Amino acid sequence: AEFQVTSNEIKTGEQLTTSHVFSGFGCEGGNTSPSLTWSGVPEGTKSFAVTVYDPDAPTGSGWWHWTVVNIPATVTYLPVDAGRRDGTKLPTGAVQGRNDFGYAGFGGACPPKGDKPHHYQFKVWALKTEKIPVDSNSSGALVGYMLNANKIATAEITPVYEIK
Amino acid sequence: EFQVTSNEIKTGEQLTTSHVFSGFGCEGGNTSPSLTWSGVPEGTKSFAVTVYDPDAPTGSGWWHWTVVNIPATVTYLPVDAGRRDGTKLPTGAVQGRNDFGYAGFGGACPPKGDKPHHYQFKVWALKTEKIPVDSNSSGALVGYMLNANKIATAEITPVYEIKLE
């Protein structure tokens, strides 16, 4: 309840803008991660992580759009485009895992044309461990296994997106 | 009508050590079981095999193996066809990346003391000859393409558990 997250670019239940849409697969978006600002950090938090996941992608496993772990416990915000794949806007110490598009960084929305809106779960994790062993080869599931094993609390924002 | 059998695995039966991962504290043989399918449906132009555990505690289950572009003339995968060096893969087939991070079969490795996990070994009859998959294709990406080209599927679901005591 106390552990919360907000953004200046996205909000729960509201259609994503073009800026956070993937560039590829017929989708021609900005492919930029929205900013995230958390609050209410749980006592004893040793690191944060952010994951973005679409449960509605018709794959059998959803779709992992972004994973970033090992954000220091002293940093309580991520700026716009912190998920860029060259890593120039990551907080010092943080590392990006591999998304389902096949690269380490943020990949925006790209739902099937004509589908009902997909839910993009942006989640900030408060973790009981300073560091987990992830690199640019870590699948979304491997990251999620480790985050679930060290979770204290999670905060989420769930924008939606559909292609008219 | 589309069906699959195996000499090494069976629905609801405990996996033997041959099919348990080698890594993450698991000390198995990490070998894929054989699979033989039949009842191939009219329209089939290739086959695919996937291995998925929905009970893995990750938020997206766990992709243990993906193999696609199995020529429409083959109805069998031999034991160890999923070795990552590709030495036992049928010609033409390609393996996608599993959640362990490699292109090849990775066996079971559930948390100690957990409820038994159900490993879905599934064969797919597809309406297309080739789908663009490579060693970097994630399990979701492969899954996206198989569901879009599916004619029929058959599956076997063995289980595996590691007691703490």
From Swiss-Prot, chain A:
It is found in: Periplasm. Keywords: Disulfide bond, Periplasm, Signal. Disulfide bonds join C27-C110. Its main location: periplasm. CDD domains: PEBP_bact_arch (cd00865). GO terms for cellular component: outer membrane-bounded periplasmic space. Belongs to the UPF0098 family. Homodimer. Encoded by the cryptic lambdoid prophage DLP12. This is UPF0098 protein YbcL. The lineage of its organism: Bacteria, Pseudomonadati, Pseudomonadota, Gammaproteobacteria, Enterobacterales.
Curated annotation (Swiss-Prot), chain B:
This is UPF0098 protein YbcL. It is found in: Periplasm. It comes from Escherichia coli (strain K12). Keywords: Disulfide bond, Periplasm, Signal. Homodimer. Disulfide bonds join C26-C109. Transmembrane segments: none annotated. Belongs to the UPF0098 family. GO terms for cellular component: outer membrane-bounded periplasmic space. InterPro entries: PEBP, PEBP-like_sf, YbhB_YbcL/LppC-like. Encoded by the cryptic lambdoid prophage DLP12. PANTHER family: PEBP (PHOSPHATIDYLETHANOLAMINE-BINDING PROTEIN) FAMILY PROTEIN, UNCHARACTERIZED PROTEIN YBCL-RELATED.
